[PDB]
Amino acid sequence: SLNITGIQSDWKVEKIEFAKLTGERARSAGANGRIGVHGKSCTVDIARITIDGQTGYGSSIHMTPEWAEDVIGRRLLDLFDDRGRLREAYRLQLEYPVLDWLGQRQGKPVYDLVSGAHLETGASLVVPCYDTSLYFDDLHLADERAAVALMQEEAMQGYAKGQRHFKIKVGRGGRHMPLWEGTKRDIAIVRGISEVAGPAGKIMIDANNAYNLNLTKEVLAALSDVNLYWLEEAFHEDEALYEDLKEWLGQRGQNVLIADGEGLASPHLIEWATRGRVDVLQYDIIWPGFTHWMELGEKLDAHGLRSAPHCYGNAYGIYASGHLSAAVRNFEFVEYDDITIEGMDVSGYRIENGEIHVPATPGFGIVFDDELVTYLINRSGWSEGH
Ligand SMILES: [Mg+2]
Ligand SMILES: [Mg+2]
Structure with a gap:
């Protein structure tokens, strides 16, 4: 239940950027009930979205460059439900950098x-x-x-x-x-x-x-x-x-x-x-x-x-x-x-x-x-x- 009233029809997705950040677990993870050693190594896929000259950051998945190409130009106010909820089509890929952006701006x-x-x-x-x-x-x-x-x-x-x-x-x-x-x-x-x-x-x-x-x-x-x-x-x-x-x-x-x-x-x-x-x-x-x-x-x-x-x-x-x-x-x-x-x-x-x-x-x-x-x-x- 985000508040789409403060959102203007001017605000537009201008640039989508993707990066895989890497890390370590504090302590290595072994096996579980069904599979083997998990390890110490960690990664995270993050997208960086620019709307209205402000950057959002957040997790992103199932997004290839061609997914992104298509979304450029679009109104931020467009990716949202009537009830102020990101449409399913953009959920995995952009929900997190979008939400982050919304808070950054507000x-x-x-x-x-x-x-x-x-x-x-x-x-x-x-x-x-x-x-x-x-x-x-x-x-x-x-x-x-x-x-x-x-x-x-x-x-x-x-x-x-x-x-x-x-x-x-x-x-x-x-x-x-x-x-x-x-x-x-x-x-x-x-x-x-x-x-x-x-x-x-x-x-x-x-x-x-x-x-x-x-x-x-x-x-x-x-x-x-x-x-x-x-x-x-x-x-x-x-x-x-x-x-x-x-x-x-x-x-x-x-x-x-x-x-x-x-x-x-x-x-x-x-x-x-x-x-x-x-x-x-x-x-x-x-x-x-x-x-x-x-x-x-x-x-x-x-x-x-x-x-x-x-x-x-x-x-x-x-x-x-x-x-x-x-x-x-x-x-x-x-x-x-x-x-x-x-x-x-x-x-x-x-x-x-x-x-x-x-x-x-x-x-x-x-x-x-x-x-x-x-x-x-x-x-x-x-x-x-x-
Ligand atoms: Mg479990
Ligand atoms: Mg189960």
């Missing part, structure tokens, strides 16, 4: 533009987040007691930077380790980090589909004392099996929410959530993205369902995610991964008390190095202009 943070009546203007935005960096980093260790320590120490690194909530990767038995040994190792790791997290610490687990329903039940029973907040993708989403699991957790009065949605989602996932089998929805912050999320969040709140936008692989989305919490009431967490992108200043954001602090600086509050971006655009990227 001298306002994007979250103020998209504001709900649940939050108020002048009041700071501080959003809960969680540490998502706990991968299968123990697979070189035969000694279960060693593995726990390594995982606890990784968690302490996050605790030291202000993280108080932890998503722990599970499903070691699915592919990478013998099923039983792996499964046991999954439990001992979660038990291990749960100490290191303390009692107020929220623990999430994510199996990246490496379980079935009896494995999940076996795992959850071995964690009934752990402050388990949610359980993410125990197996690919199936209503019947989740209907069996909610009722199972109900019997035992064990309060774990069920989260799902990332990747190639079941096209009936939402409906399954409205029939009460999935509590938390996890579509990616880049794809389908911000504008979709804004539309989706609303429906989700009407149903008293929860919004947890997936984010991993793209640092930029962490910061975007935070802004979205202003447009959705039942927003859950910012999926935080500690990454440093060259040319991408995020120091205006702060991590404290298991919470992310969103700056009042215009747009998405990220300061990009105009120069190195211009250096990268020229070196390996591209430009389209009049």
Whole structure:
């Protein structure tokens, strides 16, 4: 719900520029339930848009130079819905540099533009987040007691930077380790980090589909004392099996929410959530993205369902995610991964008390190095202009 009234029909997309910014993760990410080592290396595709002689910056995907050629000249006021929402056709490619621009021009943070009546203007935005960096980093260790320590120490690194909530990767038995040994190792790791997290610490687990329903039940029973907040993708989403699991957790009065949605989602996932089998929805912050999320969040709140936008692989989305919490009431967490992108200043954001602090600086509050971006655009990227 952007405000198209302040927008003039004079304002025109004048130049689109593309660059892939690169970085490192603070600590290398290992394997998950289904695939191998993730690594330390990170990249982000960013577009730089010029309207009315002012530059916007932001994430951009599925945009080839020929996509850009076509959009040049167009009125900014044209790419928007009647209700003040970027048209679908431009959503992935330009939604982020466009929104950034809007804030830059208006001298306002994007979250103020998209504001709900649940939050108020002048009041700071501080959003809960969680540490998502706990991968299968123990697979070189035969000694279960060693593995726990390594995982606890990784968690302490996050605790030291202000993280108080932890998503722990599970499903070691699915592919990478013998099923039983792996499964046991999954439990001992979660038990291990749960100490290191303390009692107020929220623990999430994510199996990246490496379980079935009896494995999940076996795992959850071995964690009934752990402050388990949610359980993410125990197996690919199936209503019947989740209907069996909610009722199972109900019997035992064990309060774990069920989260799902990332990747190639079941096209009936939402409906399954409205029939009460999935509590938390996890579509990616880049794809389908911000504008979709804004539309989706609303429906989700009407149903008293929860919004947890997936984010991993793209640092930029962490910061975007935070802004979205202003447009959705039942927003859950910012999926935080500690990454440093060259040319991408995020120091205006702060991590404290298991919470992310969103700056009042215009747009998405990220300061990009105009120069190195211009250096990268020229070196390996591209430009389209009049
Ligand atoms: Mg996941
Ligand atoms: Mg799934």
